[PDB]
Each structure stands twice: as structure tokens, then as C-alpha cells.
Amino acid sequence: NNSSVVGLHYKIGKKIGEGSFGVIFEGTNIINGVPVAIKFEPRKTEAPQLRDEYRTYKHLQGCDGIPNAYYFGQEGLHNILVIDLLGPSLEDLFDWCGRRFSVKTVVQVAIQMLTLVEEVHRHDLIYRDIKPDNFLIGRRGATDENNVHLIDFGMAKQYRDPRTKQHIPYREKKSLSGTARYMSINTHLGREQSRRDDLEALGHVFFYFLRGQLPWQGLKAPTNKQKYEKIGDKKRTTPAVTLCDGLPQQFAEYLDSVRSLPFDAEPPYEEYRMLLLSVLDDLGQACDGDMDWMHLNGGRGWDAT
Template identity: 55%
Template sequence: MFACVLFPLLTAGVPNVRWFGVEGDYNVLVMDLLGPSLEDLFNFCSRKLSLKSVLMLADQMINRVEFVHAKSFLHRDIKPDNFLMGLGRRANQVYVIDFGLAKKYRDTSTHQHIPYRENKNLTGTARYASMNTHLGIEQSRRDDLESLGYVLMYFLRGSLPWQGLKAGTKKQKYEKISEKKVSTSIESLCRGYPTEFASYFHYCRSLRFDDKPDYAYLKRIFRDLFIREGFQFDYVFDWTILKYQQSQIATPPSRALAPLAGPSAGMPPPVANVDRPS
């Protein structure tokens, strides 16, 4: 029930724990009901997300990782399946879930950082694991952020270069993924996409083991790109449009809604408590 120790420390973008205890032979944890995962929505959008959607997600996802780190924990399994959208008035809010692999990286009172170690087994999901994690180095804040970078590129590209590799055993597959990741330069990974994504990776990989990341800098480079592209931070994601279009097709002609025009046309209104760049 490790999650129960962590959850009370968190609020923004983390589901509330309603109850936990033992029922018969089972440990039970009751949490807020949330919406689909980003992996589900990625599949719904034919496994490609627009730059606008990725940047709106990135802003909230960096906030979530920063918040977990502020509570002295690492997540250690950053992947699309572990980020869910809310429901109802929270439908545009990103939540981070699954703290089964989370680990304290510093003492809560003194902020003494855990020591640097090597020869560690890979913890997390190999597809999104940082380079240092593959090399057996103890994870720290930089690794959660590098993993988040791979998630963003996965959304933009549709896949990562080290997906689909065949191997006889899990260990051999991890080795193949590691080899492919090492041989894929940041520039190659991010080719064809705004340079801010390469800058993100270069920054994450420049951090020392116990460095505190500059989360504001990472959010700023993506927010500046968002503004430069002329996007509106309206919480209209790719799936919002797709769902709206599907609802229009399903609606009889006599009851069809007006053309797409924000909340009055069936689009969700902005949510007051969702992170909005200033």
C-alpha cells in the first residue's frame, strides 16, 4: 500500500484516495474515477498528436513531475499509460497515477539527496527509460524528465526508433533498446520537429545526478514555441475535435449543433483549476 503513504502528500493532478483497507484476502485502494489515459487517447487519434496538443500536454505533465519531485519522490515509470485525463469539469486536467515504482530521492526534512550508485537493474518501462537508467545508474529527477521527453516525441512521431525490436529474452530486448537508444542522436530523434524538443533533451542530459532541474525553463521553451506558432491555450485537444465530429455524425440532422465555435458548439469550456500558462 505504498501509494497510500505518497498520495496524502499530493493534491494537484493526483487522484484523491477515498478509502483504503483490507477486504477479505485483498488490499483495497479506492480513488477518484478518472478518464482515459494518454495512451488510450493517442490510439483514438490514430497514433499521432498535433504539435498544439503535445505542447498543451507538456505544460501540465512537467507541472505534475515537478510537483511529485517537490514532495521528495521520483516517479520512475513515466509513460503515456500513467497519465490520465479527468472527467466532467476536470476533463482537460492531466493526472499522474501509478506510484508503484516511486522512490524517495531525498530526506523530507534535511533534503539530503540519496547517494549516486551504479549497477542498478532497470526500473520502469524500457521504451521511455533514460540513457542513464539503461546504463545502470541510480535514477534521479533528471531521469523522470528525460523519460517525459521520450513520451512527447512518441506522441509527435507516432513511434520511437527503438520500438518493435525482437529478442529472445527480456534482458536481450532491454539490451537492444539500450543499443538503439545510444546510437540514436538527439538531433536524429527530433529531426523534423521544432528545435525546442532537442533543447529539452540536451538540458535533461546535461544535469548532474543531484541537480534540481529548472522546470520553469523547460515550460518556458515550450510556452514560447506555443505562442510563436500562434496557438490558443483553449484546451481543445485533438481528441476533443474528433469526439465532437463523431457526436455531430451521430446527431440527427434536425438536432445538429451549430458549427464548431467553442463551448456553445459542444466543445468543453476552459476549466478553472487546470494549469494555464500566464
């Protein structure tokens, strides 16, 4: 099968994926030359997920920051999803900036993440896998080159009925699903996740960007279940003011606020964005869209990685 073309119009190119969440490739539409990301998944697999992820992109189609889904089908023993190709993740740019983002970069990146997560909630979905690895910027020279995007909805769940807007019932004793570094306290306790838990996870990412690390990283334990327990115990023990030591206090006020939200309550997204925006007014900075990674390699941007 020389010159492998999947989905009729998509030329398989360069591998950029992992071995756990299906291998991901670069691609080129052979009709118009637009780049795409092509994600493979074994057909007869123990965890089928790529079909519902295709329907999540179609559900969120038209949202600023959600890539377009172009094709989904079966080819051989693989399910194939084709979406827009995007740039590095905020975790990638984090590593390239010395594993520390400036206050101005964190604020501007935060208000775009709150808008993305809000748009997800608007369509009756909760993300439940908030992490900097899944927030991607655009490609070079594009109009949305430095805008934040959201991908990978394998953990997305419907939290309310699309017709009546009846919130999902609250339950407990759930299996811990997610990355323990950012998941909310309620997720450590096995509680059903809702809109408030996507925002508390964002607050953990904000302190992660500002400090360079979280005090519950590098925690050791004999098993993984007890390691998730130690991390969750440090999160309740550490007040938001302690996390915010030396930082603008609006980030601690944000984390405490989203931790106090009722289970089924609609969070004040715009009030949170205005809260993080007042940081720039307190520091005499403008929200002009200038980011730290835009100064890499001599005011040039990232390269070769």
C-alpha cells in the first residue's frame, strides 16, 4: 500500500502520536492541501472511543477553538478520525519557556481556556480531563496561530439533558478517571463530576503555570491508588492562599470560588474571566495577546520540536 491514503482524501504523513491513546499522524488533504491530524484506533478493541469522539467534534462544530472533524470510518482493522492539524500543546510551550509562564501569559491563556470550557458546557458536555497537554495553539502564519484550542474528548460526558436541561444525578463511589495532578478534590473522593470540576482543574493548571510545579507532585506511594490519595490529601491541606504565595491573589480567589460551587450550579464564567483580567490592571499590563512562547529563539517562536 505505497502512498497510503485514508479517508479518500487524506495522505498519511508523519507520526506524532503515542502508543496509549492510539497513534496520531500528520496528514494532508490531497484535494486542497490543508494539513490534518489523523488518529488511529484498533477496531476490535477493549475500549471503543473514537466513534463518540467524532460525534463530539460534530456536536461542538462551529465553536471557536474546537477543530473541525472531516472524516470517520473503518479502513482495515482501524477506526480513523480526521480533524484539523494544530500546533504544540501548552505543556510543550511550557517546557520550551523554562517550565514557567509569566502572569500576563497565564491570565490571557486562562480566559481563553475558561471560554473553551464554557462552550463545552454550553453543548451539555463536561470535559473531565483538563490538562495542559490537551490545549493546543494554532499553526504558524495562521490567523489563530496563538489562540488556544481544545482537543481529545475521550473523557467527555453529558452532564445534562439537551432538551429539558435536567442535571445528571449526584452519585459517589466512582472510579478515579483522570490525571491526578490536576483533577478536582471531588474527583479524588470518587464523586460525580460536573461543571465545577472542570473549572477547579483549570485553577490547578493556572497555579501549575505560575509556580512551575504543584506541591502535590513527586509524591511517592506503594500503589497508584494510595498515590492518588496522597495527592488529594495535600490538595485539601493546602489552602488557596498558600498556593498563591507571591502570586496575584485573584488566582487563589478563583480556586476557592470554584471549589465552593454547588454540584448542579451554573458557574459564573464571565465573572471568573473578569476576575483574572483585573490582575493585568493591578500590574499595569495590557491584554494584547502577547505570549511568552512568541519570544522564543529570538522573538521568533518555537522550532525543531
